[PDB]
Amino acid sequence: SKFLDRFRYFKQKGETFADGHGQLLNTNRDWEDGYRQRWQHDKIVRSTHGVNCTGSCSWKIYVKNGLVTWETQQTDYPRTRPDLPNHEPRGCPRGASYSWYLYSANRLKYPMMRKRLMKMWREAKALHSDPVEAWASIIEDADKAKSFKQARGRGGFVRSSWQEVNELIAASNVYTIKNYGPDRVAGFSPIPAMSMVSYASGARYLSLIGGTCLSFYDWYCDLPPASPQTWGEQTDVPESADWYNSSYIIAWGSNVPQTRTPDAHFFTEVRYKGTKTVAVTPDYAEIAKLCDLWLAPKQGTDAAMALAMGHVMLREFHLDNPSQYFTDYVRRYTDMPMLVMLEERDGYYAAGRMLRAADLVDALGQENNPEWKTVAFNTNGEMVAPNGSIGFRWGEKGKWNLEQRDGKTGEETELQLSLLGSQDEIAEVGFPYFGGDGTEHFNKVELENVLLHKLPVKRLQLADGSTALVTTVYDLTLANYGLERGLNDVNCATSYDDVKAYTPAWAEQITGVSRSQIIRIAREFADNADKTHGRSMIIVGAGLNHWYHLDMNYRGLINMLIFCGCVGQSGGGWAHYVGQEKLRPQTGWQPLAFALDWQRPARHMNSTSYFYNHSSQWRYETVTAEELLSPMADKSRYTGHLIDFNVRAERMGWLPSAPQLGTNPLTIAGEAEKAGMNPVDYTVKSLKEGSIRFAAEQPENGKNHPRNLFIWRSNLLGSSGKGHEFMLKYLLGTEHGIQGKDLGQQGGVKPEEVDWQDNGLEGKLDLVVTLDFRLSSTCLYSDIILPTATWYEKDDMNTSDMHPFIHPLSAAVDPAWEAKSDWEIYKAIAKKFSEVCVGHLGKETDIVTLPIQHDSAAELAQPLDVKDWKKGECDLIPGKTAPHIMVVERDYPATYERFTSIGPLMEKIGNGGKGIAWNTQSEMDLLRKLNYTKAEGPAKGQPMLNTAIDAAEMILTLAPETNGQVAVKAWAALSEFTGRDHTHLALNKEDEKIRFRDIQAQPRKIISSPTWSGLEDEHVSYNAGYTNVHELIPWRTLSGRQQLYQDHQWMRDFGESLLVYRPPIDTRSVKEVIGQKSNGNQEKALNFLTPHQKWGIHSTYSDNLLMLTLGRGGPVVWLSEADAKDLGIADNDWIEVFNSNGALTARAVVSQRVPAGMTMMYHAQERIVNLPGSEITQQRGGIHNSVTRITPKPTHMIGGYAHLAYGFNYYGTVGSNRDEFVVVRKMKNIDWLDGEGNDQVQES
Amino acid sequence: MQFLNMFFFDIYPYIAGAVFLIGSWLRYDYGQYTWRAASSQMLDRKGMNLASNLFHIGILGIFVGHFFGMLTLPIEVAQKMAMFAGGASGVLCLIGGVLLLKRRLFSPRVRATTTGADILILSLLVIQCALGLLTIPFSAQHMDGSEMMKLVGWAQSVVTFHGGASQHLDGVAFIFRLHLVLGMTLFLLFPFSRLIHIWSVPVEYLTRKYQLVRARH
Amino acid sequence: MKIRSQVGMVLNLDKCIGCHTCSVTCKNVWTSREGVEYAWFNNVETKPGQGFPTDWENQEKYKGGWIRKINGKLQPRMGNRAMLLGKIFANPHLPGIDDYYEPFDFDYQNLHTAPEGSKSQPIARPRSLITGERMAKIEKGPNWEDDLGGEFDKLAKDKNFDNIQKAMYSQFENTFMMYLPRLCEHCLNPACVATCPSGAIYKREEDGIVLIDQDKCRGWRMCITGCPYKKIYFNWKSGKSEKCIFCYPRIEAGQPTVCSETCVGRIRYLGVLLYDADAIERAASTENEKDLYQRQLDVFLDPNDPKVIEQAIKDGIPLSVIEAAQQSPVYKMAMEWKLALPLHPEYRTLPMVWYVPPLSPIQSAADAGELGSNGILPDVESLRIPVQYLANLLTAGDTKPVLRALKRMLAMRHYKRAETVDGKVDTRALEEVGLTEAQAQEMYRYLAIANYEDRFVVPSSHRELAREAFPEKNGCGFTFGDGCHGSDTKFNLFNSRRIDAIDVTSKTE
Ligand SMILES: Nc1nc2c(c(=O)[nH]1)N[C@@H](/C(S)=C(/S)[C@H](O)COP(=O)(O)OP(=O)(O)OC[C@H]1O[C@@H](n3cnc4c(=O)[nH]c(N)nc43)[C@H](O)[C@@H]1O)C=N2
Ligand SMILES: Oc1c(Cl)c(Cl)c(Cl)c(Cl)c1Cl
Ligand code: SF4
Ligand code: SF4
Ligand SMILES: [Mo+6]
């Protein structure tokens, strides 16, 4: 009795203490169990998150009362060396809030369908027993199709069933495939590393039926075109642990503590090791708070600083007092000693292509791919074609290595850098200079569009009779930076204060960063790299990579790292961290996701070009290739709209296409048989005759636009969708908020490769299906929503760039309500498809185009120039001057069987990637015991894939990264090419086999593999390029070395052969609309930046209440105090932001850390929470991408040329967005458009 | 009227009195978590300082008076005090009460987070206070203390268990009947409301050592 | 001389990345209920700023902590016992929900059920979690000033800017920001305990955790004012107050707190500290407030001194606790190296959660600078965060201990750079600050490498001593409602018995 206890008042009094200031009571404390029982749970399950953040953190999912209640980090990762800090606990605030989703009011519980589409679907089925025909009855009617396409994003969802929606989906896909082609069906799902199997589910189903898989690394602009350019590698960087090995680090456009949260401690802790840290951001970002120095250059001007620093370095560590380490490094690992041919001009020369062994008389002995082997001079004047050049990768074996040997005599021959001191004469070469152009918001420095420098050269006798002049990349490089070498150059600098081509004083003007600051850091960075042998590092992120000239910004930073020999050195290098693109078990996952175990090849497409076209954003282009042309280029040779360059690249086999042909590809075989010729040659003939055209040339003819789109693991229409308003208008056919006119209405010049029509085709997409667990913005505008399972309700695998562990995703409980895993959703759809397609599609023959692939033999396509077979400049030879033309067999009725089984191709042909190929039979035998096998049917005897685990197990067994057995065969295959032994990089792990249930118990470290250049050892951390430098394995580039000089035609003519400052472009999306729809409040033009937010990962978590409460409670934009006060904007005021492309609404965050001239809306806050109606469009306010628009860069389209060849996510147009300008102004009328009556009005 | 007389004044006071004790005892033993004053100040500070202090300081005046007045200087004197002393406390309590009731009913946050037991009890008190102030002009007619003698006589019979207490009342004005009825009803509803905070008045704090530490247990 | 144990906490502010992970995990586990949905036991604040609740550091307005009278005696700033009682009908100082933020939700269901034929895309607007009404606009949040979000004139109202000429900091080039994650201090002389009339708040003898007894609390809500750090939150639905409970359910088994184990920064340290309870009044009532810090370090006992060891044993401290104190990181950072400093020692509470001040980028200078006493690394003088600011926060306004901390941190860096880059032994910076090579390499071990087993050294609370573990093991958790928990008298009105107990006594003695 608690009542009777009070009577023991005095009896419970113990001793006092502190001289009567305290009393020790002996009272009951049972009440304390209250919190104890709250903490107690049913069990903990291990799992991670399937979101794009590179975190890849293992979590403990706490289940209590049969419900997921909360979660904390797993701290059991395999510990790093004793001298490096360990990874635990990792995690971030976003991840810690995931649990909120499982039962939140925003959870998608049942498959949903738009009421209008359902009503017409159910009436159509009451008239057409067969579903394909019921679909046809609706889609082929204008008033019908229109009725549901304009309902998009306008409420009206009604509960459906898996049964009803699976039929409609399969029906829609059969119709679409049988009446237009398989390539008119596509799916967009990104970053597979975050859930290998969840991505693979759709990718597999689409590949099986011949649909197109859209890229993402270039679409998001996470792809640094500079990487392929310099190393011929998509992306390969050191792990976050390696940062602790560096003694000098510069975070450049990388808000590490906010965007690389789980790895930030490596950066804060390496400081205690004596490492100096420097933050380079225009605003006082979180990254600044943890550095010893903070530099704030003008946004976009970064390449300027990089150039100046490169200057100081080349001057003080390569010229004045040379560095033994630096010199040997560039000598052996760069293309600097390589010879460049000089072209003729008017009184001056111009850098041309690189000299190839084929140009010389004897051809240097190299008779195999001589036109593909570079040349240089040795220390004894003798000319030579050293090993390693891409010419040795194919058609021969044993010379594709970076050993400093003669390609012909196989002897130890040292190469020489500068010709200075042995040049016949001194030629004057012109280099382009754009530092003088730019908009009004950036400082400029007038010099001359062309700068003449005096280069030391040598005259050589070409094999074809004539003669020309040559000079090393090293020479042009020193000339390009403006280093006075004693020939008395007027354009060369005499002191660091001299304002010439790329000096500290020069950059101080462009960037605004004191010249002395630049000189200091450059000196320190380089000094450190010298003392430690490359242990200097630069962490760069979207801060630089999302500008139209991301290439220049990066090559800027890259040359610095190379001049100090930091690449391939533990503790140094190029650390590019953006999206979670390092799906480590690559070669074991590709066959699963793209069904390469059954058919070959699959339909890959680069999303940027895809949306640029079908979203019809090219119809509003403002940028012209002309204004990007080099001053030293023949303008008349590069005419046409940007999209015209894409179309040419597509037919020259450079970039992929989708839809490919303007004619159903399943019928080409049925017409080639009647014509008496085989399908391949019948296509080459029809393409020449123009009887069969590339679909790209006529995107609006009603048969060359996608009709069915699957979206999963993406919020395309609310996040990544650059040109949100254009997508809503053209792809969806719904109300949009575009503000400008198009080329037609303005009367601009129409493309010379694509049909023009005044009224663009709208509502192209017939069916949009989105799979998600929460009702996102994309879902809101879809036709059918499929409730997918959360990351805590399904099994899958996850890996990252930051660490070498491959942990899992597990189900703490079965999916809630009617939800299903992405894998079970596509399996069910593949099942319903296989029965609905009966009598419509059978065993078909399909013609598939395939662009010249990088890492393949065909990458040695056009070596010296650019020949367009359509302009008659040469013959149409598929695989060389046009895409390959493949014949794929498709057993449509056996889709479901193939989807649920590992195909025969793994045994017949083999498996491989990145150039090599190995036998993988033993792996299949093992897989037959693990997954069991099919009893009968078309896949009888083949290993099974009924569940996600079966799939995960396939990935782990075939991948060399998770199976030491395969890892040895993989290093063996590459040893053939190199001629050096590499098996010793995996031998002592040969008996290692990672199992799904093994990693469920504890995350496991992977095995060193040729697919990557860093190592998985216990003595050295994973550093990108370490193998190239320490194993003498060549970079998949033309010269086999790190490319500093890009000699491809298009590169030379677009002034990108050597790095040069290129100011931020003008999109001209503000001047044509500012002031038009005035509301009475001052408007102003500001640079619109969108770094990634702190309260979400893209748009995920952006609707999550914990994140919304820790943030500002919805969409907001940051403005400087001046900009704000000048527009009469107080903190948290409703403001409007807009331009040609559209308008968005948000509340303002006024802050001192935002430099005047810019505004920031942290990336992804989407369109579903706390958004009022716009005064500019009279519609729901739009999103941050409502004011951006895609604008491609030509140099990002170069294909069929060694390291510049296509590859899914390897190369291709990127969707940059930081150059954008918007108009900001305070709002007046805050109308919510809900009919609630709760509207406000802001005064003044 | 005779049936309803012996009921309300010879029986009802023992029902409410039993329910009051055993009710408190049971909620104290099985309802610790529900035993609190239930502050609402944080949700709406406006006008609370004045209102609550008026209400409490007044209601307390009345309690001391009622307590020592009917459970313990001649009669006519005491009556003059009750009317002037207690009459003033009543005006304060009534005002604070009314202010608190206006708040609880029309102040968005307080009304959205309230329970019915809180509106009920507050309302009755305000009424019992108004009903009380109305007895003043009635006691006036008998400045000699004739009326007060009857009432105090009734009260003291009940608390000592001497039957026939409703007899002491013979004569008293009706208004007094009401006050005595509604009043006791509050003792009935006491244990099932917030009024339990009263039992907890923090007197022991005036002599407590500042720091408290609890041993293992 | 009464020795007692407590697990203190030290947060290395230099490593804090202002991520808030700590706050979210705490919120998920402890305060997701209606009534405390606005409470953030753990919360992070960006400084400069006024924090949460707004201006909690302003004791002149809020009345928290203790004051020292002229006669030298200690008294809660709220008032002596009678004064505090006179304020009970209405806490004249109590902070209102608005001082925190009005908790809100969103109508996501509108996105789902939006009817067919809407003139505009549906949307989820905010709703009050207190009233349930539509919200015109969200105007405040618990982390509203995150990352210098707000005009400088507004943030600079920070009480820690007193006695500092702040004009120069509104200039872009001089901008500076730091984070201050904070929980309950679990004071040695907690003001909360002293301001609760019902005496429902208390400090636990075995581990010094301060808890508000939910059975006993009567909701007088005076405690919220008494707490100078404003870490006690009134649960508006239950009527009782609630505060960080130092995750006692985990600490009892020897596990770190949730916000400690979940700290992405690896900045939180948990270690045992032995203190003389009998010295508490003495220390907290020292005349000069600039002495409270040092005076508190003097209440802590050396866990290796056998004099202390023998007294601790005599005083009830388990042997495992003492052993834990002997390898406690909290003790190394507060006593040995002097890197950790108390938060606002001037409140006289003897706070038990200390902080290592943060380093920052060098300030802006005319030129690119020169090589100082530490080479390319910074010199304490060149740090951009005004040290006086840090001192108003950690040392009652005295810049001496803060500078010593900063200088040693920097000292270590210099020593470590020589060793790992130059490959040489240079102790010039260590001698200047009074450290040795040994103390430096250890500092490095704990701060740089920070292995899990080093950041966390938490002993068991030994829930088996002075209690009856066996019957508890066998019958705890079965919550059928026996109505006998909470009292020591077995008699109960419902004629029942404890499930987790033995009622049939042994007759064999
Ligand atoms: N919390 C969180 N983490 C994530 C993500 C997320 O959505 N949320 N997403 C992933 C993904 S997919 C990416 S691509 C990255 O996180 C992007 O982060 P990063 O810090 O590189 O870019 P950002 O664009 O944010 O830029 C970083 C900072 O650089 C500054 N900045 C911006 N523009 C410039 C510029 O032109 N030059 C220079 N030097 N700096 C500039 C700025 O301070 C920004 O915060 C990554 N992890
Ligand atoms: O009811 C009473 C009240 Cl209220 C006062 Cl104040 C006094 Cl004095 C007496 Cl006697 C009675 Cl009965
Ligand atoms: S969201 Fe990414 S970074 Fe955050 S905890 Fe999850 S996996 Fe880690
Ligand atoms: S989790 Fe750690 S690093 Fe992140 S805010 Fe909290 S204390 Fe700082
Ligand atoms: Mo990205």
Side-chain angles (χ1 to χ4, degrees), chain A residues 18 32 35 79 88 105 520 1151, chain C residues 109 148 202 242 248 278 368 453 455:
Chain A
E32 295 178 1
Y35 288 120
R79 291 154 74 87
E88 60 80 15
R520 179 172 183 179
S1151 172
Chain C
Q109 274 305 301
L148 299 191
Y202 65 92
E242 285 193 87
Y248 70 78
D278 265 347
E453 62 269 46
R455 311 201 302 280

PDB file of all heavy atoms in Angstrom, chain A residues 18 32 35 79 88 105 520 1151, chain C residues 109 148 202 242 248 278 368 453 455:
ATOM      1  N   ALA A  18      27.060  16.543   3.286  1.00  0.00           N
ATOM      2  CA  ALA A  18      27.347  17.921   2.902  1.00  0.00           C
ATOM      3  C   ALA A  18      26.889  18.932   3.949  1.00  0.00           C
ATOM      4  O   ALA A  18      26.476  20.048   3.612  1.00  0.00           O
ATOM      5  CB  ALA A  18      26.694  18.236   1.552  1.00  0.00           C
ATOM      6  N   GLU A  32      10.709   2.921 -11.363  1.00  0.00           N
ATOM      7  CA  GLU A  32      11.720   2.990 -12.418  1.00  0.00           C
ATOM      8  C   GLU A  32      11.573   1.950 -13.520  1.00  0.00           C
ATOM      9  O   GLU A  32      12.139   2.120 -14.592  1.00  0.00           O
ATOM     10  CB  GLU A  32      13.133   2.897 -11.825  1.00  0.00           C
ATOM     11  CG  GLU A  32      13.535   4.072 -10.930  1.00  0.00           C
ATOM     12  CD  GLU A  32      14.934   3.916 -10.321  1.00  0.00           C
ATOM     13  OE1 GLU A  32      15.608   2.897 -10.609  1.00  0.00           O
ATOM     14  OE2 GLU A  32      15.361   4.815  -9.553  1.00  0.00           O
ATOM     15  N   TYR A  35      10.498   3.097 -17.466  1.00  0.00           N
ATOM     16  CA  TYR A  35      11.341   3.329 -18.626  1.00  0.00           C
ATOM     17  C   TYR A  35      12.051   2.045 -19.043  1.00  0.00           C
ATOM     18  O   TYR A  35      12.317   1.834 -20.228  1.00  0.00           O
ATOM     19  CB  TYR A  35      12.373   4.412 -18.332  1.00  0.00           C
ATOM     20  CG  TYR A  35      11.797   5.806 -18.250  1.00  0.00           C
ATOM     21  CD1 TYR A  35      11.912   6.561 -17.080  1.00  0.00           C
ATOM     22  CD2 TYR A  35      11.145   6.379 -19.342  1.00  0.00           C
ATOM     23  CE1 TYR A  35      11.392   7.850 -16.998  1.00  0.00           C
ATOM     24  CE2 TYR A  35      10.620   7.670 -19.270  1.00  0.00           C
ATOM     25  CZ  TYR A  35      10.747   8.396 -18.097  1.00  0.00           C
ATOM     26  OH  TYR A  35      10.233   9.670 -18.019  1.00  0.00           O
ATOM     27  N   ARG A  79      37.175  -4.590 -37.608  1.00  0.00           N
ATOM     28  CA  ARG A  79      38.073  -3.489 -37.289  1.00  0.00           C
ATOM     29  C   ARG A  79      39.221  -3.243 -38.270  1.00  0.00           C
ATOM     30  O   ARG A  79      39.782  -4.176 -38.832  1.00  0.00           O
ATOM     31  CB  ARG A  79      38.602  -3.689 -35.871  1.00  0.00           C
ATOM     32  CG  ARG A  79      37.516  -3.500 -34.814  1.00  0.00           C
ATOM     33  CD  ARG A  79      37.820  -4.264 -33.547  1.00  0.00           C
ATOM     34  NE  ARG A  79      38.885  -3.675 -32.744  1.00  0.00           N
ATOM     35  CZ  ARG A  79      38.694  -2.722 -31.836  1.00  0.00           C
ATOM     36  NH1 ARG A  79      37.472  -2.246 -31.616  1.00  0.00           N
ATOM     37  NH2 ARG A  79      39.720  -2.246 -31.146  1.00  0.00           N
ATOM     38  N   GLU A  88      32.766   2.072 -36.893  1.00  0.00           N
ATOM     39  CA  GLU A  88      31.629   2.236 -35.996  1.00  0.00           C
ATOM     40  C   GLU A  88      31.595   3.644 -35.442  1.00  0.00           C
ATOM     41  O   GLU A  88      32.634   4.237 -35.177  1.00  0.00           O
ATOM     42  CB  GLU A  88      31.711   1.221 -34.855  1.00  0.00           C
ATOM     43  CG  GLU A  88      32.965   1.347 -33.990  1.00  0.00           C
ATOM     44  CD  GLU A  88      32.884   2.471 -32.953  1.00  0.00           C
ATOM     45  OE1 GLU A  88      31.776   2.991 -32.681  1.00  0.00           O
ATOM     46  OE2 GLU A  88      33.944   2.827 -32.399  1.00  0.00           O
ATOM     47  N   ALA A 105       1.366   8.048 -41.590  1.00  0.00           N
ATOM     48  CA  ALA A 105       0.185   8.383 -42.367  1.00  0.00           C
ATOM     49  C   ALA A 105       0.511   8.486 -43.843  1.00  0.00           C
ATOM     50  O   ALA A 105      -0.395   8.602 -44.660  1.00  0.00           O
ATOM     51  CB  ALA A 105      -0.408   9.694 -41.885  1.00  0.00           C
ATOM     52  N   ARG A 520      50.513  30.267 -51.211  1.00  0.00           N
ATOM     53  CA  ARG A 520      50.839  29.535 -50.000  1.00  0.00           C
ATOM     54  C   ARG A 520      50.377  28.088 -50.054  1.00  0.00           C
ATOM     55  O   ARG A 520      51.191  27.166 -50.006  1.00  0.00           O
ATOM     56  CB  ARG A 520      50.222  30.213 -48.777  1.00  0.00           C
ATOM     57  CG  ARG A 520      50.521  29.454 -47.504  1.00  0.00           C
ATOM     58  CD  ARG A 520      50.098  30.177 -46.242  1.00  0.00           C
ATOM     59  NE  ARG A 520      50.508  29.385 -45.088  1.00  0.00           N
ATOM     60  CZ  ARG A 520      50.313  29.725 -43.821  1.00  0.00           C
ATOM     61  NH1 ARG A 520      49.707  30.866 -43.522  1.00  0.00           N
ATOM     62  NH2 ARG A 520      50.731  28.919 -42.851  1.00  0.00           N
ATOM     63  N   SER A1151      20.411  34.340 -43.977  1.00  0.00           N
ATOM     64  CA  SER A1151      21.618  34.028 -43.221  1.00  0.00           C
ATOM     65  C   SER A1151      22.882  34.733 -43.673  1.00  0.00           C
ATOM     66  O   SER A1151      23.096  34.991 -44.852  1.00  0.00           O
ATOM     67  CB  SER A1151      21.871  32.520 -43.243  1.00  0.00           C
ATOM     68  OG  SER A1151      23.127  32.204 -42.668  1.00  0.00           O
TER      69      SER A1151
ATOM     70  N   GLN C 109      -2.427  12.233 -45.531  1.00  0.00           N
ATOM     71  CA  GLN C 109      -3.565  11.506 -46.065  1.00  0.00           C
ATOM     72  C   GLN C 109      -4.279  12.268 -47.167  1.00  0.00           C
ATOM     73  O   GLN C 109      -4.948  11.660 -48.011  1.00  0.00           O
ATOM     74  CB  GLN C 109      -4.539  11.139 -44.953  1.00  0.00           C
ATOM     75  CG  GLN C 109      -4.170   9.848 -44.264  1.00  0.00           C
ATOM     76  CD  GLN C 109      -4.020   8.690 -45.239  1.00  0.00           C
ATOM     77  OE1 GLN C 109      -4.958   8.338 -45.961  1.00  0.00           O
ATOM     78  NE2 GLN C 109      -2.836   8.089 -45.264  1.00  0.00           N
ATOM     79  N   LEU C 148      23.435  29.061 -38.567  1.00  0.00           N
ATOM     80  CA  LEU C 148      23.305  30.491 -38.752  1.00  0.00           C
ATOM     81  C   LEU C 148      22.061  30.892 -39.535  1.00  0.00           C
ATOM     82  O   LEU C 148      22.082  31.851 -40.310  1.00  0.00           O
ATOM     83  CB  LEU C 148      24.563  31.034 -39.439  1.00  0.00           C
ATOM     84  CG  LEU C 148      25.852  30.815 -38.639  1.00  0.00           C
ATOM     85  CD1 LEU C 148      26.979  31.598 -39.258  1.00  0.00           C
ATOM     86  CD2 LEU C 148      25.655  31.268 -37.210  1.00  0.00           C
ATOM     87  N   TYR C 202      15.183  13.073  -7.624  1.00  0.00           N
ATOM     88  CA  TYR C 202      16.292  12.587  -6.816  1.00  0.00           C
ATOM     89  C   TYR C 202      17.492  12.100  -7.610  1.00  0.00           C
ATOM     90  O   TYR C 202      17.404  11.817  -8.808  1.00  0.00           O
ATOM     91  CB  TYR C 202      15.805  11.465  -5.916  1.00  0.00           C
ATOM     92  CG  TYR C 202      15.347  10.245  -6.672  1.00  0.00           C
ATOM     93  CD1 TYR C 202      16.224   9.195  -6.944  1.00  0.00           C
ATOM     94  CD2 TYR C 202      14.037  10.143  -7.130  1.00  0.00           C
ATOM     95  CE1 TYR C 202      15.803   8.076  -7.656  1.00  0.00           C
ATOM     96  CE2 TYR C 202      13.610   9.033  -7.835  1.00  0.00           C
ATOM     97  CZ  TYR C 202      14.494   8.007  -8.094  1.00  0.00           C
ATOM     98  OH  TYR C 202      14.055   6.915  -8.788  1.00  0.00           O
ATOM     99  N   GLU C 242       9.271  15.485 -17.195  1.00  0.00           N
ATOM    100  CA  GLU C 242      10.115  14.410 -17.690  1.00  0.00           C
ATOM    101  C   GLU C 242      11.424  15.001 -18.155  1.00  0.00           C
ATOM    102  O   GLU C 242      11.469  16.146 -18.584  1.00  0.00           O
ATOM    103  CB  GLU C 242       9.398  13.660 -18.832  1.00  0.00           C
ATOM    104  CG  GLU C 242       8.286  12.731 -18.321  1.00  0.00           C
ATOM    105  CD  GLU C 242       7.757  11.738 -19.362  1.00  0.00           C
ATOM    106  OE1 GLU C 242       8.354  10.649 -19.489  1.00  0.00           O
ATOM    107  OE2 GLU C 242       6.753  12.033 -20.053  1.00  0.00           O
ATOM    108  N   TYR C 248      19.303   5.004 -18.131  1.00  0.00           N
ATOM    109  CA  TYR C 248      19.629   4.079 -17.069  1.00  0.00           C
ATOM    110  C   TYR C 248      19.314   2.623 -17.406  1.00  0.00           C
ATOM    111  O   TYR C 248      19.996   1.726 -16.930  1.00  0.00           O
ATOM    112  CB  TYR C 248      18.992   4.522 -15.752  1.00  0.00           C
ATOM    113  CG  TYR C 248      17.497   4.414 -15.638  1.00  0.00           C
ATOM    114  CD1 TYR C 248      16.876   3.189 -15.402  1.00  0.00           C
ATOM    115  CD2 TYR C 248      16.705   5.556 -15.680  1.00  0.00           C
ATOM    116  CE1 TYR C 248      15.496   3.115 -15.206  1.00  0.00           C
ATOM    117  CE2 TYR C 248      15.328   5.493 -15.485  1.00  0.00           C
ATOM    118  CZ  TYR C 248      14.730   4.278 -15.249  1.00  0.00           C
ATOM    119  OH  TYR C 248      13.366   4.252 -15.065  1.00  0.00           O
ATOM    120  N   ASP C 278      30.259  14.797   0.462  1.00  0.00           N
ATOM    121  CA  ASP C 278      30.330  15.749   1.571  1.00  0.00           C
ATOM    122  C   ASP C 278      30.955  17.093   1.239  1.00  0.00           C
ATOM    123  O   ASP C 278      30.820  18.040   2.005  1.00  0.00           O
ATOM    124  CB  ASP C 278      31.066  15.128   2.762  1.00  0.00           C
ATOM    125  CG  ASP C 278      30.119  14.494   3.778  1.00  0.00           C
ATOM    126  OD1 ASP C 278      28.893  14.737   3.705  1.00  0.00           O
ATOM    127  OD2 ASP C 278      30.610  13.758   4.662  1.00  0.00           O
ATOM    128  N   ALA C 368      48.494  36.037 -46.596  1.00  0.00           N
ATOM    129  CA  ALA C 368      48.304  34.593 -46.478  1.00  0.00           C
ATOM    130  C   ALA C 368      48.881  34.019 -45.185  1.00  0.00           C
ATOM    131  O   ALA C 368      48.816  32.809 -44.949  1.00  0.00           O
ATOM    132  CB  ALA C 368      48.918  33.885 -47.681  1.00  0.00           C
ATOM    133  N   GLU C 453      36.027   0.497 -27.220  1.00  0.00           N
ATOM    134  CA  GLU C 453      36.385   0.105 -25.858  1.00  0.00           C
ATOM    135  C   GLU C 453      37.095   1.197 -25.070  1.00  0.00           C
ATOM    136  O   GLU C 453      37.289   1.061 -23.866  1.00  0.00           O
ATOM    137  CB  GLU C 453      37.275  -1.135 -25.880  1.00  0.00           C
ATOM    138  CG  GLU C 453      38.586  -0.914 -26.608  1.00  0.00           C
ATOM    139  CD  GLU C 453      38.506  -1.266 -28.080  1.00  0.00           C
ATOM    140  OE1 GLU C 453      37.531  -0.871 -28.763  1.00  0.00           O
ATOM    141  OE2 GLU C 453      39.442  -1.937 -28.554  1.00  0.00           O
ATOM    142  N   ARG C 455      36.293   4.785 -25.726  1.00  0.00           N
ATOM    143  CA  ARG C 455      35.336   5.873 -25.549  1.00  0.00           C
ATOM    144  C   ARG C 455      34.312   5.513 -24.483  1.00  0.00           C
ATOM    145  O   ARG C 455      33.815   6.380 -23.767  1.00  0.00           O
ATOM    146  CB  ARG C 455      34.590   6.174 -26.847  1.00  0.00           C
ATOM    147  CG  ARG C 455      35.451   6.339 -28.071  1.00  0.00           C
ATOM    148  CD  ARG C 455      34.690   7.128 -29.159  1.00  0.00           C
ATOM    149  NE  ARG C 455      33.421   6.521 -29.584  1.00  0.00           N
ATOM    150  CZ  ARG C 455      33.317   5.507 -30.441  1.00  0.00           C
ATOM    151  NH1 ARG C 455      34.409   4.969 -30.973  1.00  0.00           N
ATOM    152  NH2 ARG C 455      32.121   5.057 -30.797  1.00  0.00           N
TER     153      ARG C 455
END
